[PDB]
Every structure is written in C-alpha cells, then in structure tokens.
Enzyme design. Structure first.
Site, PDB file in Angstrom:
ATOM      1  N   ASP A 236       2.542   4.672   8.462  1.00 49.35           N
ATOM      2  CA  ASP A 236       1.148   5.001   8.720  1.00 49.35           C
ATOM      3  C   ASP A 236       0.718   4.394  10.063  1.00 49.35           C
ATOM      4  O   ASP A 236       1.505   3.692  10.705  1.00 49.35           O
ATOM      5  CB  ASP A 236       0.257   4.529   7.561  1.00 49.35           C
ATOM      6  CG  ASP A 236       0.219   3.028   7.354  1.00 49.35           C
ATOM      7  OD1 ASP A 236       1.161   2.488   6.715  1.00 49.35           O
ATOM      8  OD2 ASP A 236      -0.761   2.391   7.809  1.00 49.35           O
TER       9      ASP A 236
ATOM     10  N   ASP B 162       0.810  -1.217   0.000  1.00 52.72           N
ATOM     11  CA  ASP B 162       0.000   0.000   0.000  1.00 52.72           C
ATOM     12  C   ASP B 162       0.849   1.277   0.000  1.00 52.72           C
ATOM     13  O   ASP B 162       0.632   2.190   0.793  1.00 52.72           O
ATOM     14  CB  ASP B 162      -1.052  -0.020   1.145  1.00 52.72           C
ATOM     15  CG  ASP B 162      -2.192   0.987   0.994  1.00 52.72           C
ATOM     16  OD1 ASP B 162      -2.397   1.507  -0.140  1.00 52.72           O
ATOM     17  OD2 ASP B 162      -2.873   1.258   1.997  1.00 52.72           O
TER      18      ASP B 162
ATOM     19  N   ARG C  73      -0.240   9.018   1.044  1.00 54.33           N
ATOM     20  CA  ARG C  73      -1.054   9.022   2.262  1.00 54.33           C
ATOM     21  C   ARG C  73      -0.392   8.117   3.325  1.00 54.33           C
ATOM     22  O   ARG C  73      -0.639   8.280   4.507  1.00 54.33           O
ATOM     23  CB  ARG C  73      -2.478   8.537   1.954  1.00 54.33           C
ATOM     24  CG  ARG C  73      -2.537   7.111   1.420  1.00 54.33           C
ATOM     25  CD  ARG C  73      -3.933   6.580   1.237  1.00 54.33           C
ATOM     26  NE  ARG C  73      -3.889   5.272   0.566  1.00 54.33           N
ATOM     27  CZ  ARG C  73      -3.862   5.106  -0.751  1.00 54.33           C
ATOM     28  NH1 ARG C  73      -3.877   6.153  -1.560  1.00 54.33           N
ATOM     29  NH2 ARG C  73      -3.809   3.891  -1.269  1.00 54.33           N
ATOM     30  N   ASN C  74       0.505   7.194   2.880  1.00 50.05           N
ATOM     31  CA  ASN C  74       1.197   6.239   3.727  1.00 50.05           C
ATOM     32  C   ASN C  74       2.635   6.590   4.013  1.00 50.05           C
ATOM     33  O   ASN C  74       3.422   5.733   4.408  1.00 50.05           O
ATOM     34  CB  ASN C  74       1.028   4.847   3.155  1.00 50.05           C
ATOM     35  CG  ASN C  74      -0.356   4.348   3.492  1.00 50.05           C
ATOM     36  OD1 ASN C  74      -0.907   4.634   4.563  1.00 50.05           O
ATOM     37  ND2 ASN C  74      -0.970   3.631   2.606  1.00 50.05           N
TER      38      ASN C  74
END
Ligand SMILES: Cc1ccc(NC(=O)c2ccc(C(F)(F)F)cc2F)c(-c2ccc(F)cc2)n1
Length: 304
Positions: free
Chosen positions: A174, A156, A160-161
């Site tokens: 994260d 992933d 955003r991570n």
C-alpha cells in the site's frame, strides 16, 4: 503503522535523480502524503522509460522516511509490491514503487463480482471463477510467508492493502492511504488512532497484542474477502457490534462461492488460541495445491 512496528524492535537504499522522475498526475491523497503516477527514466534495462507509483512525503519525519526506505529495500519478494528506491534531492521527498495497473485487490474483486456495473484483457467476462479466486489467495499467502519468514507483523492485512498488476499478479502493499480511502474499514478510538477491528482477532481487540498469529487470522479474513468479491467483513454490524461478535467467539459465515475445503483453511486461521492457528507456510502450501490442481478436480469442488 506496520513498517514502523517492525522498526520499533528491529544504507543499501537506491537513489533516483529528480530529473529522472516525471510526475504525470495524482492517483490519491491523504494525511501522511499523496500518490502520483510518474514516468521514470534509466531505472530498468531494455525499457529506457517506465511507469511507477510515487509516494510524496507530506517536521522530524525525514528520519522515519529513511528507515522505512531501508526496511522497504530489504522487503523484496515476488508477492511484495516492488520498491525501486527514493528521491532525496529537493522537496517533496519521494518513494518510488512499481505501478500496479489494476489498483488495490478490494477494488479489483468488487469490479469482477456479481454487484459490478459491467473489457477482458487479464480476466474473462462476468464474475471471477474459482480458479481465479484461488490463485489470488495463494499469492497473498506466499507474500505473508515471506513476511513471517523475515518475522514482520503487518498489523493491517486486508485486500485494500494488496495490489493487482498485469496478468493478475497480486502483491501485498500500500501507499499509506487506506485510512483515508477506506475510512469505514477502521474504528476511530479517539483523536488520531484508527483500528481495522473487522480484520482483528480477539487478543488484538481485547489485549491490544499484534503478532505473526494475529496476521494469520487477518489472512483468514482476507480469504473471506476474496470469496465474497471484496465485501466488508461483518458488514451487517456496526463497529461496537462487530467488536462484540469477535470477542464472543463468533465466526464469519461460509461465502456462497467458497468450497468446504477453502472454508477449512479460514476456520484454521480463526482458532481463538493463537498457538492453535495454522502456520502461514501450511495455509499457503494448502492454497498453492488448490490453485494448481486440474480443472477436473477443481470442478468437483465447486457445486451448483
Ligand atoms: C500510515 C501507514 C500505514 C500503513 C503503511 N503500510 C505499511 O506499513 C506496509 C507497507 C508495505 C508492506 C509490505 F509487506 F508490502 F512490504 C507492509 C507494510 F506493513 C504505511 C506506509 C508507510 C510508508 C510506505 F512507504 C508505505 C506505506 N503508512
């Protein structure tokens, strides 16, 4: 599930007293748990007290916590979010990480992009410059090199991570809430399962295979996100149209702010054949030089 995937193939964990952790306020919440800003005492020398991000585990999930904490203790690098340890005395069980002042890389990119509303401690007024964008990408690559080095499949990788700290330090990491905070970045297959399809290569969508190579493809997509100031890849398309475009060999367009040389690093991650894809070591080595290159050479790369 990232850390879980590496565990399903394959203690030095540091412990912290509950009295040494003081919860201040919530930072976010989901399904797997919530995140709090806390004050930690006697953690690091010459500090006495310091700010940390605390993950509070929300069943036979306590064993999962321990192996995740063991994995997190091993995963230590300059561009991997610092894991300080756990607190196992009393509930809720907590994982303690460093506090990253600027939050996730997506939020930071958009707030310093041409679509931001509006002071300038770590970075200049207006959109981020080429040099700023390159240093960002290089740190993410460095972190991915350490992960391919320890032969870890992220599953992933997306801005955003990643998280941003003081002095523009970027690290992969994260708190397990991306699916709650960025739900439109996942395609809900059925029941629980949510896939980051816009970031996935054809073999992960088609064959459901996840490797070190599907991770370089994601990095290519992270490189695109950096140069589009955190825009969602294939934003113009629905989930089904995006699955279609990826599986039919379509490549993401060259962002405005992206030099042909940076686009060549991207295209190299986007080879249909996992084997053909350029190694993360060379993608990083290419980015390190581009990031640490004179402004005379850098200014000739960016036109208009
Ligand atoms: C539901 C869900 C989904 C994804 C997650 N993230 C990870 O597995 C992950 C975290 C960190 C790193 C790296 F590289 F920084 F070490 C690599 C990773 F793949 C989590 C998560 C679970 C426990 C935890 F302590 C933190 C995050 N949970």
């Amino acid at each position: 599930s990232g850390l879980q995937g590496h565990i399903i193939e394959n203690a030095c964990v540091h412990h912290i007293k509950r009295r040494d952790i003081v919860l201040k306020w919530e930072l976010g919440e989901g399904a797997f748990g919530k995140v709090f800003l806390a004050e930690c005492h006697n953690l690091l020398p010459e500090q006495d007290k310091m700010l940390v991000a605390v993950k509070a585990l929300k069943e036979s999930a306590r064993q999962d916590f321990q192996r995740e904490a063991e994995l997190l203790t091993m995963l230590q690098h300059q561009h991997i979010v610092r894991f300080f340890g756990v607190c196992t005395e009393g509930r809720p069980l907590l994982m303690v990480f460093e506090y990253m002042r600027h939050g996730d890389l997506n939020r930071f990119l958009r707030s310093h992009g041409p679509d931001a509303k509006l002071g300038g401690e770590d970075v200049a007024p207006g959109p981020l410059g080429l040099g700023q964008l390159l240093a960002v990408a290089s740190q993410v690559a460095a972190g991915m090199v350490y992960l391919a080095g320890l032969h870890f499949v992220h599953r992933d990788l997306a801005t955003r991570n990643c998280l941003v700290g003081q002095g523009l330090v970027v690290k992969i990491g994260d708190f397990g809430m991306s699916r709650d905070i960025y739900s439109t970045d996942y395609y809900r297959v059925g029941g629980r399962t949510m896939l980051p399809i816009r970031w996935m290569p054809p073999e992960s969508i088609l064959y459901r295979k996840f490797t070190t190579e599907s991770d370089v493809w994601s990095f290519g997509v992270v490189l695109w996100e950096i140069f589009t100031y955190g825009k969602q890849p294939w934003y113009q398309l629905s989930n089904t149209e995006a699955i279609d475009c990826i599986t039919q060999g379509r490549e993401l367009e060259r962002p405005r702010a992206c030099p042909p040389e940076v686009y060549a690093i991207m295209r190299g991650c986007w080879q249909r054949e996992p084997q053909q894809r350029h190694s993360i070591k060379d993608v990083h080595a290419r980015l390190q030089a581009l990031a640490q290159a004179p402004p005379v050479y850098l200014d000739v790369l960016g036109h208009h």
